[PDB]
Design a protein around this ligand. Structure first.
Ligand SMILES: [Cl-]
Ligand SMILES: [Cl-]
Ligand SMILES: [Mg+2]
Ligand SMILES: [Mg+2]
Ligand SMILES: [Mg+2]
Ligand SMILES: [Mg+2]
Ligand SMILES: [Mg+2]
Ligand SMILES: [Mg+2]
Ligand SMILES: [Mg+2]
Ligand SMILES: [Mg+2]
Ligand code: NA
Ligand code: NA
Ligand code: NA
Ligand code: NA
Ligand code: NA
Ligand SMILES: [Sr+2]
Ligand SMILES: [Sr+2]
Ligand SMILES: [Sr+2]
Ligand SMILES: [Sr+2]
Ligand SMILES: [Sr+2]
Ligand SMILES: [Sr+2]
Ligand SMILES: [Sr+2]
Lengths: 140, 186, 160, 95, 154
RNA sequence: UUAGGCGGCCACAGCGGUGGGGUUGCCUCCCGUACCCAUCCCGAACACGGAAGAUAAGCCCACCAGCGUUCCAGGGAGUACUGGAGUGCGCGAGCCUCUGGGAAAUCCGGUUCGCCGCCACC
RNA sequence: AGUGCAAGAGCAAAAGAUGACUUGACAGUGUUCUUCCCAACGAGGAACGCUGACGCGAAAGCGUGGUCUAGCGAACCAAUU
RNA sequence: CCUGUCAAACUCCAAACUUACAGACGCUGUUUGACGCGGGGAUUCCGGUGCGCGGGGU
C-alpha cells in the first residue's frame, strides 16, 4: 500500500530564461544530456517583436540523470516552505524545478484511455517536503 | 457540469477510447473495420461491421485463445500479434467477410508495429485490406527473431516461466503452419 | 414637449445601447430615499403607488413626481424621518423626435422613459403607523405629475 | 431583406443549441437510404459539407438515387419540383 | 351525432371556413346536415363554430325534420315512412332517425341528400352576433336548445 | 464483462464524494531498452520486450444528491400569450365575452450518480 | 483563444497551434440548387459527380483554393493558347 | 449575501400558430376527364378600404 504511494521524481527541468544562446554550453555539461531552445508569443516592447525566436533553453531530466543532478544541485539551495507548489513541486534559483508524483502518473500522461489523477492520489506539499527532506537535506 | 450551456463530450470521447474524426473517415469506405487493439499482456483483433444499435463483430481473435492451437509462448509480442491477426482473418473468411479496412484506434502508425503485424496477418488469411508493404516489419521480426537474438545477450534468461532458454521463433513457423492448414477447428 | 407624444406604447422596445448613441442622461436624481440603511421589513406599514393604465413615463416626469413626493415626506417627517421610499422603475426606453419633411424621418435621440404596465407599483414607501397619512399625501402629489390615474394601495397595515 | 445571399436570415435555423455544439456523431453521416425512402431535410450546423439551400429546411423529400456519396432527393417547392443534392448528415428517415 | 345549421352568410367569411362548410355538404344559409362525432368531424365544426348552430337533436325532433325536409339524392320525392321503407335499410323514419343518431349509416348511404334544406326559424332565431351563452344563436346547443331551433325551422 | 474490445443514444451519462475488488485468469499501474519505432531535450510520451511487485491510481462493483442535467406530481395557472367570432365595454391607448389552444419564472415533493447493442470471457 | 476582412454562423485527439512535405488555386466534362422562394430570365456563385493527371497519408481518406454567406461583367474587336 | 430594473439587432426557456410528407374522414374526378401536359388569345404591372400583425412619423 505504502509502496504504490511513495513519491518519485517525474522530472527535473533546468532552465535559463535569457531574452536573446551562448548559455546552451553550460547546461549540457552540468546536466549530462542535450538542451533545447525556447521561443515566445505576443509582441513585447523590450525589443522582443520576433515571435518565434531563441530566448531561452531548458533540459528535462529523468531517472538517473535527474537524481545524479539533484545530489549536486540541492546542496546549492536553501529550500523554503513557500517554495512548494500545491501539487508538491518546488522551484529554486538558472532555475531548477523538480516534478514529484506517486507511482501511477502514467495514467494521466498516456494516450489511450488517459485520466486525470484524483485529488487523493495527488501529492501534497507536506508529503513532498517529507520525501525530499528524507533524502540528504533540511526543510523550512 | 458547470451549467445548462455547458457541453459535455460524447461518452466514448470522455473516456478517451474513440477518435470520432478517424472513425468517420474509416466508415466512409463501406467495408468492415479490422479493429486492431493491444494490451500489456495481450493483442486482440476484431472484424467489425456497422449496426443499427451499435457495431457488429462478425469475427474476432484474442491472443489468449491463441494457445488453444499450441502456443506455449508469451502473448504480447510480434509473433503473437501477427498470429492473432491471421486467426481473426481466417475466422472472418469463414463468416463470409472478404474485405476490410485497418482501424488502429488510438495506437500509432509506427513502421513495423504490432497493429501492422495484425494487419499483415489478416491479409495473409485471405482478406483484402488496403495496406502498404514497406510500413510492415520485415518477415523475421514478425517471426520473433529480434527477441531470440535479444536472449542471445543472455547471462540471465529473458523468460521467467520456462518456455525455453534460447527461445523459438520456429514455434511461430509451427503455429502459422497449423493455421494455414485446411483442417483446424476455428 | 407634451407627454402626448410619448405616453403610449406604440413603438418597438428601443433599449439596445450598443446600437443607439447620444442618449441624454437621466434627470432622476435618486431611486432609494429616506433611510436606505434600514430594511423594508423593519416597518409596520408599506404603501405603494399603482399605475392604473399601461404607459411610458419620461424621466422628466419620474423626477418631477418623485421629487414632489419625497420633498413632502422630508417636510413632514424631517430630512431623516423614519421612512424609506423607493422608485422601482428605470427609464430604459429611448425616445426620438423627427426634429427634410417626411424624407429620412427616423428621429434623433431626445430622451428616455419607463414602461409601466397597468396594476404595477411605480413607488413603494415604508413607514410607521403614525406617518401613513403623510406618505399617502406624498403619493397624492406624485400621481398629479404622471400621465395615468393611480391607486394608493396599503400593502401592510390594518391600523385603521 | 437587406441582402440576398443564401445565408440571409438563417441565423436561427443554422445554429446549434449550446448542448448540441461541437462535432456530430458519424453514424447519421454514413446512414444508407433507399430509392423511394422518405427523408426529412434538416441541415446539421456542425456539418459544413453536403448542405442544401437553407430555404429547404423542413422539407420531406423522396430519395431517388445518389450522386457520389451524396443523395439526390426530390421535393416540391411550392408547386415546382426540384432535385436536391444532400449528404446523409443532413437527412433523417420519416416515421 | 350533431346537427349543423348555417346561420351566417358566405359574404366576408374566411375562405377556409366557407370551404369547410361546403365539405360538410352545406352551401346555403339555413341548410342543415347530420355530422358524426369523430375527431376529424369535431375539428371541422370548431372551425365553423361562429357561423353555425349545432348540437345533438332528440330522436323526435330528428324524425319531424327528416319527414318535413329530407329529400332523395334526386327529385322532390317525399321522404315518408313508405319512402324510407322501399329505399332504405329501415322500416320507417324512426328506424332511420335512430341509426343516424347511433351513427350506423348516413343520409347519403341511404340514397338521401346529405342536406336538410330547412325553412327560416318561425318567430326568428336568437341572433347571429352572439353565442348561446350570451343569449345568441351561434355555436353549440343543448339537446333542448337545438330542437327548439330545428323545430322552429320545420 | 471477478475488472475485456468495438459501439449506439451523446450530462438521465456532468461536477463532487463514500465504500469494496484481483497467485499461475483480465485490465492496469508496474519492470525494462537488444531490437521496429521514438523525443526540435528527455524509453516522459510514442514504440518495442517483459513480469519482481501492487490493488494505491485508473478501470470494474456497490452507494450518496450538495451542484449541473432528464423526467414526473402538486402549486404558480387555465394565469401570460394566442387562432376563430361579436351592432360587447372604453374619449382613447386599450379591454371584455364566447370558441379552440396554452406557457415561463418560481415553490414544493419525487426522479436522475446513465440506458441499450454486438463480440469475447469462470 | 484562434481561424485575413462586416455581421451572423461553424470548429478542440480541430476547421485552431506547431512542424514537415506539397502545389487540387490542376485539365476535361457534367448533375443539381442558387442567381430569379412560389414562377419564366443571362453573367456570376455553390454543392455534388464522372474522366485524366497528381499531392499527402499506413490506410480509410482528404485536396474541384482560403470554415460558411460579399470580392463582380454581354455582343462586337484585339492580344494570347 | 441582500435589494431595484431592462432588451428590434439577448436567450437557460417558450407558445398560440405557420409549414414539409403521409394515413384517415370529408369533398372531388374517371359520359361534367379531374391532376397534368402542349398550343392560341389576352387583359394587367397608378389601386383602395376594413380587420389582425406590423415598421416610420407628434
Ligand atoms: Cl489499443
Ligand atoms: Cl439546394
Ligand atoms: Mg428570426
Ligand atoms: Mg335534389
Ligand atoms: Mg315575424
Ligand atoms: Mg335581431
Ligand atoms: Mg481502494
Ligand atoms: Mg367604441
Ligand atoms: Mg463596343
Ligand atoms: Mg491579351
Ligand atoms: Na432634403
Ligand atoms: Na453536434
Ligand atoms: Na529551433
Ligand atoms: Na485501486
Ligand atoms: Na449560371
Ligand atoms: Sr407606431
Ligand atoms: Sr394623473
Ligand atoms: Sr519505465
Ligand atoms: Sr385623450
Ligand atoms: Sr387543454
Ligand atoms: Sr470549403
Ligand atoms: Sr409567418
Amino acid at each position: 500500500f505504502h509502496e504504490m504511494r511513495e513519491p518519485r521524481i517525474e522530472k527535473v527541468v533546468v532552465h535559463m530564461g535569457i531574452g536573446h544562446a551562448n548559455a546552451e554550453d553550460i547546461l549540457g555539461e552540468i546536466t549530462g544530456q542535450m538542451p533545447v531552445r525556447t521561443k515566445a508569443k505576443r509582441t513585447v516592447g523590450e525589443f522582443d517583436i520576433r515571435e518565434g525566436d531563441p530566448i531561452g533553453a531548458k533540459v528535462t531530466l529523468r531517472d538517473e540523470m535527474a537524481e545524479e543532478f539533484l545530489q549536486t544541485a540541492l546542496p546549492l539551495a536553501e529550500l523554503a516552505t513557500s517554495q512548494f507548489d500545491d501539487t508538491g513541486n518546488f522551484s529554486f534559483g538558472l532555475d531548477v524545478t523538480v516534478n514529484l508524483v506517486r507511482p501511477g502518473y502514467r495514467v494521466a500522461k498516456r494516450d489511450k484511455a488517459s485520466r486525470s489523477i484524483p485529488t487523493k492520489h495527488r501529492l501534497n506539499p507536506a508529503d513532498a517536503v517529507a520525501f525530499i527532506e528524507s533524502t540528504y537535506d533540511v526543510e523550512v | 457540469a458547470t451549467g445548462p450551456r455547458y457541453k459535455v463530450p460524447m461518452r466514448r470521447r470522455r473516456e478517451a477510447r474513440t477518435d470520432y474524426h478517424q472513425r468517420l473517415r474509416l466508415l466512409k469506405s463501406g467495408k468492415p473495420r479490422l479493429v486492431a487493439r493491444k494490451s500489456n499482456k495481450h493483442v486482440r483483433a476484431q472484424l467489425v461491421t456497422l449496426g443499427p444499435n451499435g457495431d457488429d463483430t462478425l469475427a474476432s481473435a484474442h491472443s489468449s485463445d491463441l494457445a488453444e492451437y499450441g502456443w506455449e509462448a508469451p502473448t504480447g509480442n510480434m509473433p503473437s500479434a501477427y498470429l492473432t491477426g491471421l486467426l481473426a482473418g481466417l475466422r472472418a473468411q469463414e463468416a463470409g467477410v472478404e474485405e476490410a479496412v485497418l482501424d488502429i484506434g488510438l495506437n500509432s502508425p509506427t513502421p513495423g508495429s504490432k497493429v501492422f503485424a495484425i494487419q499483415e496477418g489478416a491479409i495473409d488469411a485471405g482478406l483484402d485490406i488496403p495496406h502498404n508493404d514497406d510500413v510492415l516489419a520485415d518477415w523475421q521480426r514478425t517471426r520473433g527473431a529480434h527477441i531470440a537474438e535479444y536472449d542471445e545477450q543472455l547471462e540471465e534468461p529473458l523468460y521467467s516461466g520456462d518456455f525455453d532458454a534460447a527461445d523459438l521463433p520456429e514455434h511461430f513457423d509451427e503455429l502459422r503452419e497449423t493455421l494455414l492448414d485446411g483442417d483446424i477447428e476455428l | 414637449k407634451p407627454a402626448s407624444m410619448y405616453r403610449d406604447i406604440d413603438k418597438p422596445a428601443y433599449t439596445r445601447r450598443e446600437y443607439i448613441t447620444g442618449i441624454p442622461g437621466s434627470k432622476i436624481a435618486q431611486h432609494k430615499m429616506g433611510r436606505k440603511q434600514k430594511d423594508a421589513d423593519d416597518y409596520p406599514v408599506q404603501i405603494s403607488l399603482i399605475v392604473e393604465e399601461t404607459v411610458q413615463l419620461r424621466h422628466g416626469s419620474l423626477e418631477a413626481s418623485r421629487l414632489s413626493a419625497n420633498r413632502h415626506l422630508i417636510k413632514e417627517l424631517g430630512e431623516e424621518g423614519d421612512y424609506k421610499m423607493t422608485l422601482r422603475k428605470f427609464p430604459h426606453q429611448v425616445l426620438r423626435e423627427n426634429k427634410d419633411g417626411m424624407r429620412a424621418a427616423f428621429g434623433k435621440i431626445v430622451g428616455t422613459a419607463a414602461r409601466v404596465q397597468a396594476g404595477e407599483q411605480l413607488f413603494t414607501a415604508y413607514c410607521n403607523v403614525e406617518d401613513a397619512e403623510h406618505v399617502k399625501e406624498a403619493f397624492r402629489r406624485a400621481y398629479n405629475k404622471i400621465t395615468p390615474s393611480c391607486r394608493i394601495k396599503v400593502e401592510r397595515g390594518e391600523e385603521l | 431583406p437587406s441582402s440576398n445571399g443564401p445565408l440571409e436570415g438563417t441565423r436561427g435555423k443554422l445554429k446549434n443549441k449550446p448542448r448540441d455544439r461541437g462535432t456530430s456523431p458519424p453514424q447519421r453521416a454514413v446512414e444508407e437510404f433507399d430509392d423511394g425512402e422518405k427523408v426529412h431535410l434538416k441541415i446539421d450546423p456542425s456539418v459544413p459539407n453536403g448542405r442544401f439551400h437553407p430555404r429547404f429546411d423542413g422539407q420531406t423529400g423522396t430519395v431517388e438515387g445518389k450522386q457520389g456519396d451524396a443523395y439526390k432527393v426530390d421535393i416540391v417547392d411550392g408547386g415546382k419540383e426540384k432535385t436536391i443534392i444532400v449528404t446523409a448528415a443532413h437527412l433523417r428517415r420519416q416515421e | 351525432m350533431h346537427a349543423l345549421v348555417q346561420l351566417r352568410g358566405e359574404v366576408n367569411m374566411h375562405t377556409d371556413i366557407q370551404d369547410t362548410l361546403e365539405m360538410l355538404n352545406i352551401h346555403h344559409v339555413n341548410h342543415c346536415t347530420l355530422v358524426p362525432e369523430t375527431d376529424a368531424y369535431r375539428g371541422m365544426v370548431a372551425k365553423v363554430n361562429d357561423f353555425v348552430a349545432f348540437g345533438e337533436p332528440s330522436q323526435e325532433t330528428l324524425e319531424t325534420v327528416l319527414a318535413t325536409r329530407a329529400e332523395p339524392l334526386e327529385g322532390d320525392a317525399d321522404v315518408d315512412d313508405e319512402w324510407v321503407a322501399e329505399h332504405t335499410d329501415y322500416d320507417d323514419i324512426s328506424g332511420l332517425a335512430f341509426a343516424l343518431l347511433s351513427e350506423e349509416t348516413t343520409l347519403r348511404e341511404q340514397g338521401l341528400s346529405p342536406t336538410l334544406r330547412l325553412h327560416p326559424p318561425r318567430g326568428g332565431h336568437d341572433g347571429v352576433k352572439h353565442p348561446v351563452k350570451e343569449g345568441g344563436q351561434l355555436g353549440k346547443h343543448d339537446t333542448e336548445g337545438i330542437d327548439d331551433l330545428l323545430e322552429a325551422m320545420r
